[PDB]
Amino acid sequence: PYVLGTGLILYLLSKEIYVITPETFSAISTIGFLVYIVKKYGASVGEFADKLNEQKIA
Amino acid sequence: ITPVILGLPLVTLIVLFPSLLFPTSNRLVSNRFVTLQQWMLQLVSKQMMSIHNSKGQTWTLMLMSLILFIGSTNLLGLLPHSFTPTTQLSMNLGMAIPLWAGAVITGFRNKTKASLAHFLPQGTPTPLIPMLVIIETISLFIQPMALAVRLTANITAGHLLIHLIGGATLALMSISTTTALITFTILILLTILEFAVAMIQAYVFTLLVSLYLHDNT
Amino acid sequence: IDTAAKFIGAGAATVGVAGSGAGIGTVFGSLIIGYARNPSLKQQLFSYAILGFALSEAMGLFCLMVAFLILF
Amino acid sequence: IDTAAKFIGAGAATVGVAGSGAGIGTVFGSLIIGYARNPSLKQQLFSYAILGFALSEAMGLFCLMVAFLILF
Amino acid sequence: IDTAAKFIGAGAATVGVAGSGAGIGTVFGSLIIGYARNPSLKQQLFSYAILGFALSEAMGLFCLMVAFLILF
Amino acid sequence: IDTAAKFIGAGAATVGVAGSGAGIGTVFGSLIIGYARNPSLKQQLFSYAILGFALSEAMGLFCLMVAFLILF
Amino acid sequence: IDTAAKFIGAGAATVGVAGSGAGIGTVFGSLIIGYARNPSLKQQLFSYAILGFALSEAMGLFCLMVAFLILF
Amino acid sequence: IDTAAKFIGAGAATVGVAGSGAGIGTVFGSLIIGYARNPSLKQQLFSYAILGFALSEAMGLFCLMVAFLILF
Amino acid sequence: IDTAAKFIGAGAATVGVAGSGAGIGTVFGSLIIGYARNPSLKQQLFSYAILGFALSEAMGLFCLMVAFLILF
Amino acid sequence: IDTAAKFIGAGAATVGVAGSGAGIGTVFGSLIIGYARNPSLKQQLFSYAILGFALSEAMGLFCLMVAFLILF
Amino acid sequence: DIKTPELIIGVSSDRGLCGAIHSSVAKQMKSEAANLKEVKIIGVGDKIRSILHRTHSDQFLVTFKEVGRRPPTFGDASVIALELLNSGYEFDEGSIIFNRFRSVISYKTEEKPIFSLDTISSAESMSIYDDIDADVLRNYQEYSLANIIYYSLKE
Amino acid sequence: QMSFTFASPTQVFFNSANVRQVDVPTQTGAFGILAAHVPTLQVLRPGLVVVHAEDGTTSKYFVSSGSVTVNADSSVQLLAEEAVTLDMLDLGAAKANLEKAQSELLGAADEATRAEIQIRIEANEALVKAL
Amino acid sequence: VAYWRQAGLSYIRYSQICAKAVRDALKTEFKANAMKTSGSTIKIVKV
């Protein structure tokens, strides 16, 4: 969860610091990012289960 | 200065944290933090290692660094905007030398006259025909190295067309949003479906090609 | 001359989408007869169809990047 | 020149429908040879022929948008 | 400029039929090779070749209407 | 201009016979593959090859009509 | 213009020889993959190879007739 | 004439990407209709698919370097 | 016009070499998928491939002499 | 005129390299389905595929030489 | 069904006529021999090679022994099949005559015909068939030669 | 559906069972022969018989050789020379054989001789493949 | 065709090597049975 939040912040900095698109384009990209999230947050937990168990087993 | 100078350092640091964080995960902590990020290179060492070795461990991590660097570089052009039209193009040209040099390191440096002697002796290039070996030295390097520049420009365009079609769709239907929002919504998501995928597959080409080099090397 | 040849030259680059559209009918058609011999529908076959159409429409998005660079 | 190059430029963009035209005959051709191998006609096979005629007429709709941009 | 470019606009719009004629050869070929494997000829398969030779000529009537628009 | 663009437009329409030429080869090639699978050469399969050369030369006669209209 | 367009119009009909040259590559290809199935090499298949390369070169000899007519 | 013809000269060289567009669909499509016959997917076939896609984007690395030469 | 459009008329006549190049790929492909059935390598299938690549680049030598007539 | 239509003559000569790109996929794609029947990889079929890649990219070399002729 | 206007092969044990096995085929194979198939005989059972054994010291292609002593198995069928293949049959229409057992108390002296003329096996109605190659054809004929063989023998 | 006869001389697995599919690696190829096939004859490549009965289940066997012949009608007869379940098939042997198989191959001879190995290689491999 | 077919062999020959090869394989228990299964208790009489 903490990682995800850090990555979002960095992007925002880049957009503001760097040359920017149109407002409409930008607004959308942010919406576009959101859609992936909801599946992802369930996915991120699932990711967690696999690797640390595979690490623990070995 | 700051903008151009800030962009390349910024790129590095996003790859650097994963590249530091995973080395770090080899004993601590993990809490939430370390294990979370170990996830990043474990996705690299999970996902990309499903393709690698393959060429063998020796080259494997050498190429995976460029693959991750390209995908991460383009992810660092994904997010920032404006960034793709300028900085990602300068990063595509800054990835151009790495893409050229990736064949150079072992191919042209050890055999410039026939870097296909490392890459592909018999295949595309005719091994019976050193002329076709040098000709396809372009289609397996000189060009493929220009393609790797065109490949990022292929992404730039598709990313651009999303912005242009987007901005043109919202410029066309400045309704607030309304029906253009629905399509415009897609047009952004097309940025991921187009650039962020084809970007990836783009470095995947440099992967596989520098694999087919070092795998026969 | 500087604006006229920019409208009839952005039309000749729109004929480069003739390869991305006929190629898409070859990347999906050879997937129709592919799953006809069967059976790996989800994964393997249709997964290779997505990585093929992405490498088919890439010559359509880059050709529409040289089209929109002549009119905008 | 201003009304000339947009009238000959809208004609060159109509050569992008030659890809979707033959690309529609192939996706509906491999479905004719696929259902010849039988028998999952309704659902699976003929339900994918719509997914193959949509990704092929998407470049056609992208080409018919260009020819209508120089015509209106 | 006005009288000339409309003649060099319906000429390049006739190069969109180059898919409707070859794609019909692709679908009617796949029905020619499909009926060889047998036996649904007077039903099922040759009734899908009419649905294929139409969708191919569907980009052959849409392209032909643009060449008839630039002329008259 | 008016007696000029008629010659640089009637020639571009002859590039529409590229689908009629490559459609005749594909419809006959799969007929040569369909009669290689045997056995209904006399009617049924090669009879349908005439019904495939007609629906493929129709997109070549309609394209040759537009080329003849811009020349005479 | 009156002398210029005939030269630009002869080359444009010479692009219609790209359909006849690939339609001969499909008819002789499907005869090369139609003789591997065996055994009637002489007659039937390769006897219809010239009968399939006659209707496909018929689009080329008509196109190179429209290219020569704008030259003489 | 000098700067005007450099705009409708890299646009006609952009329609050369239609060969690489459908050539990548014919190459990857045959690999989807090849691994369906199974089972040498990992290496042998998909490894050869990276040799065929590079030799098809080789013409794409020589046609996009042509239009980028008439630009700057 | 006279010493101009013949230089852009030899460019359009060199587009006819898209059928002699894509006809060789269709010919020298079915004689690679047909020899996979085996075992008529010499004397039969590859011998007919010499007579397959003889009527393929015959439309290309006729397209290389059409461009040579618009130069020398 | 002399410097103008030489730039629009090299561009249409680069469209003749659309046959080699789609010829490269249809020749190295039939060998991607030949080894799927197996097992002549690095023997007969992959050896003839290089002799099929050379016969198709030569029609791309004989077309890029026309594009280099109208450029230097 | 694939039938021509145009071998034979006795099948049994090496051990006597504990039924009318050998004699039956003997009969019907002598019945045969005139008629034209090919007069090639294979005798499974060398008690075949008794009942017919004279110019069935001269009409056989092969004969088989250790017929029983552990009931025949597929292997055998294949075995006998295998060498059979490599035979100077001019693979006419072959017959396999054996006694198909019918029940504890009943058997029937059989024949089946072998579409050894693989070409009848190519012909006709056999067309709709696919994997039609004189390969899988033969290569079924092959397989079936054992299958049948096995069976018959077992019968 | 299909009378699917999955049989082997020794084992009939399915007996005219209205099976939806058998995925079937004839040397012809791997296919999903579905309930009621077209006249076709097939040679069994060693592979698996994946027996999609009308039951969701698809059963594994690895098959050595034989025929499935997928008929004009709806009879499918896998006539397996020997088609066995991985259950009873020993990887330990298979792999071991298989490496060996190539090893032996290296000292083998003619098309046939090599073949004996190669066939095996192929086979054992395809078992190893399978498991 | 094959390295077999053109080595002649047969589908039998092929097959048998498969079949055998399976016999070669299997888990040992099952290998007990092996010899039962498609053995050949024969004298191959040559006539």
Numbering used by the authors:
A (entry chain T): 1 to 58
B (entry chain W): 10 to 226
C (entry chain O), D (entry chain P), E (entry chain Q), F (entry chain J), G (entry chain K), H (entry chain N), ...: 2 to 73
K (entry chain G): 56 to 61, 67 to 96, 101 to 219
L (entry chain H): 15 to 145
M (entry chain I): 1 to 47
Paper passage:
In the mitochondria of eukaryotes, adenosine triphosphate (ATP) is produced by the ATP synthase, a ∼600 kDa membrane protein complex composed of a soluble catalytic F1 region and a membrane-inserted FO region. In the mammalian enzyme, the subunit composition is α3β3γδε for the F1 region with subunits a, e, f, g, A6L, DAPIT, a 6.8 kDa proteolipid, two membrane-inserted α-helices of subunit b, and the c8-ring forming the FO region. In addition to the rotor, the F1 and FO regions are linked by a peripheral stalk composed of subunits OSCP, d, F6, and the hydrophilic portion of subunit b. The proton motive force, established by the electron transport chain during cellular respiration, drives protons across the FO region through the interface between the a subunit and the c8-ring, inducing rotation of the rotor.
3D classification of the images resulted in seven distinct maps of the enzyme, each showing the complex in a different conformation. State 2 could be divided into states 2a, 2b, and 2c, while state 3 could be separated into states 3a and 3b. Because there were two sub-states identified for states 1 and 3 there is only a single sub-state to sub-state transition for these two states. In comparison, the state 3a to 3b transition reveals bending of the peripheral stalk near where the b subunit enters the membrane. The largest change between the sub-states of each state can be approximated by rotations of the α3β3 hexamer relative to the rest of the complex by angles ranging from 10 to 16°. All of the sub-state to sub-state transitions include a slight rotation of the c8-ring against the a subunit. The different sub-states do not appear to have a specific sequence or represent specific intermediates in the catalytic rotation sequence. Instead, the differences in conformation between sub-states when taken together illustrate the flexibility of the enzyme, a property that has been linked to its rapid rate of enzymatic activity.
